[PDB]
């Protein structure tokens, strides 16, 4: 749905759809070359549905074609500085594709704007939908829009006849977080049964390692997900499927 969504919002007014409790394959996101832009940064793009994360965010908007460069880890530029900034430790991928076939009025779309004025660049994932007129000069910009009072919000003119460098592109960026809490989505790899007392390769709820699995007398506390060792290394894990 979010990819085949009929509509997108502006870059400054960028959607942040939270995603949880899924079975993500991403397989359709490999074969489908419909995404002219597909640049995983945190992880190898091929290796996703073999991994999984606590939570994932789907930020969506539509921007100018060239600006796809601006959305990069630590990238610089007006959209990046005034409309949407990526985390320096970006954990995920960026999906962008041309939307001229959709985001183009015959007379040109005015529907998509961008904030080109701000006295302080946004933090990563910050979202400033502020509408108030921007004071360009030093005058007290008192409700009068115009000289020394410029409108920070400027619209894209998306005509079908514009250049590709100016052509509208549909973009969705996914950000992941591989944290301590149980993951909400994991890729399609069917589990197996418990095994005891054998040097085996294991992978629990995404946590990977090798060794021998033993029951323990460890008194976890009813919330405690799992333990670690004084080497900050894993000591014990709880089966998701069994306490």
């Amino acid at each position, epitope marked *: 749905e979010v990819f085949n969504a009929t509509r997108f919002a502006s870059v400054y007014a960028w959607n942040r759809k939270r995603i949880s409790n899924c079975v993500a394959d991403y397989s359709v996101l490999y074969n489908s070359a419909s995404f002219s832009t597909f640049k995983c940064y945190g992880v190898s793009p091929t290796k996703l549905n073999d991994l999984c994360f606590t939570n994932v965010y789907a930020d969506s908007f539509v921007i100018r074609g060239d600006e796809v460069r601006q959305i990069a880890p630590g990238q610089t530029g007006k959209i990046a500085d005034y409309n949407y900034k990526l985390p320096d430790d970006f954990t995920g991928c960026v999906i962008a594709w041309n939307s001229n076939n959709l985001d183009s009025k015959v*007379g040109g779309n*005015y*529907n998509y704007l961008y904030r080109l004025f701000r006295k302080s660049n946004l933090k990563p994932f910050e979202r400033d939908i502020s*509408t108030e*007129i921007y004071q360009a000069g030093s005058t007290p910009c008192n*409700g*009068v*829009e*115009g*000289f020394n009072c410029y*409108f920070p*919000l400027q*619209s894209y003119g998306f005509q079908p006849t514009n250049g590709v460098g100016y052509q509208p592109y549909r973009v969705v960026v996914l950000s992941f977080e591989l944290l301590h809490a149980p993951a909400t989505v994991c890729g399609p790899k069917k589990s197996t049964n418990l095994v005891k007392n054998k040097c085996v390769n294991f992978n629990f709820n995404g946590l990977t390692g090798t060794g021998v699995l033993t029951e323990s007398n460890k008194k976890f506390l009813p919330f405690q997900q799992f333990g670690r060792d004084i080497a900050d290394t894993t000591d014990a894990v709880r089966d998701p499927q069994t306490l």
Partner: antibody, heavy 106, light 107 residues
Framework: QVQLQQWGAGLLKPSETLSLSCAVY????????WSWIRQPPGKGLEWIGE???????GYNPSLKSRVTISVDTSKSQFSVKLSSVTAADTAVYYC??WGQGTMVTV | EIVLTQSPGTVSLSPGERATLSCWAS???????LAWYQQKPGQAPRLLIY???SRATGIPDRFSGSGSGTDFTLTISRLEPEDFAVYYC?????????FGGGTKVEI
């Protein structure tokens, strides 16, 4: 394609109110700036109010606290509501971002 | 409060002559905030020049604007048989957007 049709004009008794209609075709009123322009018979143009697409709106001092402009994105129509009308408000109101003109007699 | 002083109030000219419309403002208008409108009799306002230097889209090249500060000047280098209309200038450098009284182009 691009056309702005004005409506809501007519003769009005003093101190009454009025609501303008400005039907736009081919334009996104919520996405482009809109203003209403009046012209009394034999005078020049007088900018009364303007509405920024994001929602911001302003009114000239002669219509301050008496006029109210808004838009129905549900119909993509520009509206200019004036209250406490008088003789001096008689002017030809055409809506522009121009329209066809709507004579107001009061 | 910016009152635009257009002169002359009337101008009679023959076709092919150069017609200049003068537009002075009571206060200096920053960044050439001057817009020109030509209003045919019984017709709606029609934009001619924007920013006092940028002509409107589709307006003839015979139209030309000039001036800076407290002077705005509209030039029609070669008069046209349909150029005998009222021209009103509008200054939008202040919140009270104001226009000039209009100059009538006669025959």
């Amino acid at each position: 394609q691009v056309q702005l049709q004005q409506w809501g004009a007519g003769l009005l008794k003093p101190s009454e109110t009025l609501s303008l209609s400005c039907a736009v075709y081919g334009g996104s009123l919520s996405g482009y700036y809109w203003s209403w322009i009046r012209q009394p018979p034999g005078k020049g143009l007088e900018w009364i109010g303007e509405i920024n697409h994001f929602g911001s709106t302003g009114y000239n001092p002669s219509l301050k606290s008496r006029v109210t402009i808004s838009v129905d994105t549900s119909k993509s129509q520009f509206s200019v509501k004036l209250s406490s009308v008088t003789a001096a408000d008689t002017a030809v109101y055409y809506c522009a971002r121009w329209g066809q003109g709507t004579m107001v007699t009061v | 409060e910016i009152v635009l002083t257009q002169s002359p109030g009337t101008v009679s000219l023959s076709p092919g002559e150069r017609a200049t419309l003068s537009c002075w403002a009571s206060q200096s208008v920053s960044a050439s905030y001057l817009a020109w409108y030509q209003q045919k009799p019984g017709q709606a306002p029609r934009l001619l020049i924007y920013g006092a230097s940028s002509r409107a889209t589709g307006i003839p090249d015979r139209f030309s604007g000039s001036g800076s500060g407290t002077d705005f000047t509209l030039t029609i280098s070669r008069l046209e048989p349909e150029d005998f209309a009222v021209y009103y200038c509008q200054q939008y450098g202040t919140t009270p957007r104001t226009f000039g009284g209009g100059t009538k182009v006669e025959i």
